[PDB]
């Protein structure tokens, strides 16, 4: 019975159980947590009041690295430590709080980013900006009958086709201000990106949350094709480890996670699992790939 422990869900902690199950599938994050909490074990072991210690022992039990006799784990201690200081924003909350505790080495999700904005009517380039990312949040383009949506299409749109109209072109504005007759062209800007350092744990986020004209939240259920292997050479090799899937609508939905089985070491298992909080069942790669991914966790091979 090669299964992972489950997680209790009293009613509204799916967004965390789904993320935790996925984070336990990235062995380098867990290894970085161990070497980070080594500082607290210098004197005695510090069994407490620390977020990294609470997260590590959860991920170590979920990845079957620590012997667990309870067939279900309870992660409520992680939520209480967060409150004293959407599964995607929780990911950004956890990574930020771990960085504040470290303020050592950067967590394997940390990447570097170089960005530039170019006007679509005169090709004027904005000043180059330097950024960091812990995840690549991608837009989902428009669908079409007989035209399937792929993750690569989303990655190309994210790199050189992302539109932004929070800015205006200085060249087109000076020109339009002339003694003649000049028509105002629609301000269209594209944000051309180029990734610098690729992190060894890659998180890809598909933006499924939209907003109507009256402020009501909308969900895009369109399927995005992805594979267990993802090459990032065209944007400069990653293996899919887990997938966070959101079912239902924005109001009465539910978070679930597909994840790989824990290794029998360093060799990634081909056995996928379906984890809905406390329920853990075996699954096939065909089921994983047929789902509408919300968060994709990869690892550099
Ligand atoms: C888990 N145990 N529960 C309780 C009932 C549901 C209610 N909450 C949601 O359905 C929910 N909350 N946030 C989102 C969300 C945000 C952004 C993007 C997506 C997607 N795809 C979903 O859904 C949760
Ligand atoms: Zn321009």
UniProtKB/Swiss-Prot annotation:
Expressed in skeletal muscle, pancreas, liver and kidney. GO terms for biological process: autophagy of mitochondrion; mitochondrial fusion; negative regulation of mitophagy; pexophagy; protein deubiquitination; protein K11-linked deubiquitination; protein K6-linked deubiquitination; proteolysis. Inhibited by the diterpenoid derivative 15-oxospiramilactone (S3). It is an enzyme of class 3 (hydrolase). GO terms for molecular function: cysteine-type deubiquitinase activity; cysteine-type endopeptidase activity; deubiquitinase activity. Residues 5-301 form the USP domain. It comes from the Eukaryota. Deubiquitinating enzyme tethered to the mitochondrial outer membrane that acts as a key inhibitor of mitophagy by counteracting the action of parkin (PRKN): hydrolyzes ubiquitin attached by parkin on target proteins, such as RHOT1/MIRO1 and TOMM20, thereby blocking parkin's ability to drive mitophagy. Preferentially cleaves 'Lys-6'- and 'Lys-11'-linked polyubiquitin chains, 2 types of linkage that participate in mitophagic signaling. Does not cleave efficiently polyubiquitin phosphorylated at 'Ser-65'. This is Ubiquitin carboxyl-terminal hydrolase 30. It comes from Homo sapiens. The chain holds residues 64 to 502 of 517 of the full protein.
């Amino acid at each position: 019975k090669g299964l992972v422990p489950g997680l209790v869900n009293l009613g509204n902690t799916c967004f965390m159980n789904s993320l935790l199950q996925g984070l336990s599938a990235c062995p380098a994050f867990i290894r970085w947590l161990e070497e980070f909490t080594s500082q607290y074990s210098r004197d005695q072991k510090e069994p407490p009041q620390y977020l990294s210690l609470t997260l590590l022992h959860l991920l170590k039990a979920l990845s079957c690295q620590e012997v667990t006799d309870d067939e279900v784990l309870d992660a409520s201690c992680l939520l209480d430590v967060l409150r004293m200081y959407d599964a995607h924003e929780l990911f950004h909350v956890i990574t930020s709080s771990l960085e504040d505790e470290r303020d050592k080495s950067q967590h394997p999700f940390h990447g570097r980013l170089t960005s530039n904005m170019v006007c679509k009517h005169c090709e004027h380039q904005s000043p180059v900006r330097f950024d960091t990312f812990d995840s690549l949040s991608l837009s989902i383009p428009a669908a079409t009958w007989g035209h399937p949506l792929t993750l690569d299409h989303c990655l190309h749109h994210f790199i050189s086709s992302e539109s932004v109209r929070d800015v205006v072109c200085d060249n087109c504005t000076k020109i339009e201000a002339k003694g003649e007759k000049v028509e105002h062209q629609r301000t269209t800007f594209v944000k051309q990106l180029k990734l610098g350092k690729l992190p060894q744990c890659l998180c890809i986020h598909l933006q499924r949350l939209s907003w109507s004209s009256h402020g009501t939240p909308l969900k895009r259920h369109e399927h995005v094709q992805f594979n267990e292997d993802l090459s990032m050479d065209e944007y400069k090799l990653f293996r899919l480890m887990a997938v966070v899937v959101h079912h239902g609508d924005m109001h009465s939905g539910h978070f679930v996670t597909y994840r790989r089985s824990p290794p029998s070491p360093l060799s990634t298992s081909n056995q996928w699992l379906w984890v809905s909080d406390d329920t853990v069942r075996k699954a096939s790669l065909q089921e994983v790939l047929s789902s509408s991914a919300y968060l994709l966790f990869y690892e550099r091979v």
